[PDB]
Symmetry: D3
Subunit: 150 residues, 6 copies
């Protein structure tokens, strides 16, 4: 249960705006454990797979183009209720409606330039992690601060 | 649309408590662009005009007295949905009910000493900006970070 | 009214995670005044009294054991609406459901390791303060920033 | 003596990089009092006057061009030893040689894009303030935190 | 050796300026362990004893008066080289000459209102701790983060 | 010249203490560009190669053991004078002697647990980058903020 994992990606706008360290620090302070981490420029295929769920929609081409427009920092965090907790820390789709204190609430203004991606569910988290990372790239032995869990 | 503007004023208590830089930084981090900025001690007339909407109420005299009691930092910010977004960043009238993460939620305790003023609408924003600033004092050419807007 | 007081305790996990200064700073920035402060390792009796309200429940033994497992930083803050305001700053019982910007929302993950204690009411605040502090240990003459209250 | 004043200007690169609030906060935290403040796009004449001391040098044309390339946030701070203290807070001409903790040490990399200007002496501070601000724009009645001066 | 201790006191100006949490956080982040902590209003006798080394000097009366003018937060920190390390974190006697990054460099302007006290040596640290704290008030069992010491 | 690169590694203690995001943010704020990034648990061979320069010394076995004791966040930053600048931001070998404002000055206490590694020269930076990263893992097209370089 405390072994739950989520996939987060600091999108090109977030990387370009120098928000990588600020975003990672928020998750480390919360107590989640960094299990995978690497910077990369996504290829079209990985992009199309990541957004496959929208492949029938019109905006799908825009999503693929943007995520491949520059480097992305992909990461996997582990902890209890991480998937839902990470979404709460990010905010809502529209940054302008995101509450102050959340990532998008503090730094974003446009839905199209919303800084970060967080899996919306455990199953999507599982698919995305396996999509973005090779098993060799993920920590197998995870140990959080002992003052974090009862 | 991304040319929307709002008027913000760091009231005398906020200036006296050394919260000017902290408040400006929150808006700059969000991505809004500083279009006008100056410190001044409001005269009675500008004050009465700013709060004209309350001129029939009893507390109106108290509002005018306080805002003229010391320096005020007036500023104009530009961005998409800035008017509503800036209000969300400020919090609610009563600082004690404002959520942690918002300006009044983080620093205020009294309705009467609530640190900052934000226009409540585009039309009030337009009236206030034209009230507090001469056109010469506002940037005509505004350019935000290109990683902010799609 | 502006003489209202609340009891806060940074529990063993919070002390062990180096969150004492971060927690105090949040309350000082808000404008509340530190009226009592000391680090101690609670004895079983003080613990049982603090959680007396749960003495009939099963988890009561767990509460007493944990709070006595290490040092605790007890403090008393004074200000208008401090009791409710301090609870809002802390968040909800479950850290995972606490909103970003609140103490538990920013730093906690487990109900059992939720970092801090805040009185839930004026009467409980009164009982706890008198329980944890000798009158000699509390400031009698309190003076907040004059820019805080109208 | 505690009435000493200095002129600071957040140059175009600093304004464009969203460092205005961060810079003001550093001076407010230190205890200096904001006496003048306004955003403006310097004209060529004000620029040439500001850098008149270099009018015989080759790089002088570059200085004038850059400072007039965009908005600048000009400010005047008051306090004991403000002139030398503000320079120490800024760092050295070359940002790369500026120590971590100073403005240029924390945020700059190029001598040509060094973020901020601080008067190098009382006499230059006097000339610059009178150059950049009309007397009407400066606070006459200055009152710092009483816990700042003995 | 890693059991070395120092005495720190947040003086009345520091407490009044809301700098208590900020100061404690700096020491916790560094890795030092809080061993004693309490707020108090020093009596004349404790004051005269604390500054006994200056009892023959003229300014001695001023030191005693100020430290007894309001609450003080006394604390004892433990760690390797804590005594010298804590002084380096504080800065020099004159806040204006203290480097940015240090406590006095970041927040002070006057020698007379220099925010904090740090023992200048192990022997003075020993005398001050035994002067300000009863043994019952100090942690006997100290355990720092295991990732701090080799 | 503005294409200079350095290799930084957040060692196991730094990763375990949740300092990864804090360290990256310091470099991003400075203006350096993240060119490579990944978390890994170094193997003995990579370790021995990284510290090959000390292979004749006694402490060499201790260095290899520690760096392989847990995950490490390796990164490559690009910018003008990055190699020397990054060392200045880190501090000196002994954290206790590192000045407040630097990474080791703010967070470390023991030479053996000094949080981070920074190449000491361009040639060592070149050897380390080629040692720790495959060319495919480094950005070829680097573009910093245009407000950073003249």
């Amino acid at each position: 249960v405390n072994k739950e994992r989520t996939f987060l990606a600091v999108k090109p706008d977030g990387v370009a705006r120098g928000l990588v360290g600020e975003i990672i620090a928020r998750y480390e302070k919360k107590g989640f454990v960094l299990v995978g981490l690497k910077q990369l420029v996504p290829t079209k295929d990985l992009a199309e797979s990541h957004y496959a769920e929208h492949k029938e929609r019109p905006f799908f081409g825009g999503l693929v183009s943007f995520i491949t427009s520059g480097p992305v920092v992909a990461m996997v965090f582990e902890g209890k209720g991480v998937v839902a907790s990470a979404r709460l820390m990010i905010g809502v789709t529209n940054p302008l409606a995101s509450a102050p204190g959340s990532i998008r609430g503090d730094f974003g203004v446009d839905v199209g330039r919303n800084i970060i991606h967080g899996s919306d569910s455990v199953e999507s988290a599982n698919r995305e992690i396996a999509l973005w990372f090779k098993p060799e790239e993920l920590l197998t032995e995870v140990k959080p601060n002992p003052n974090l869990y009862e």
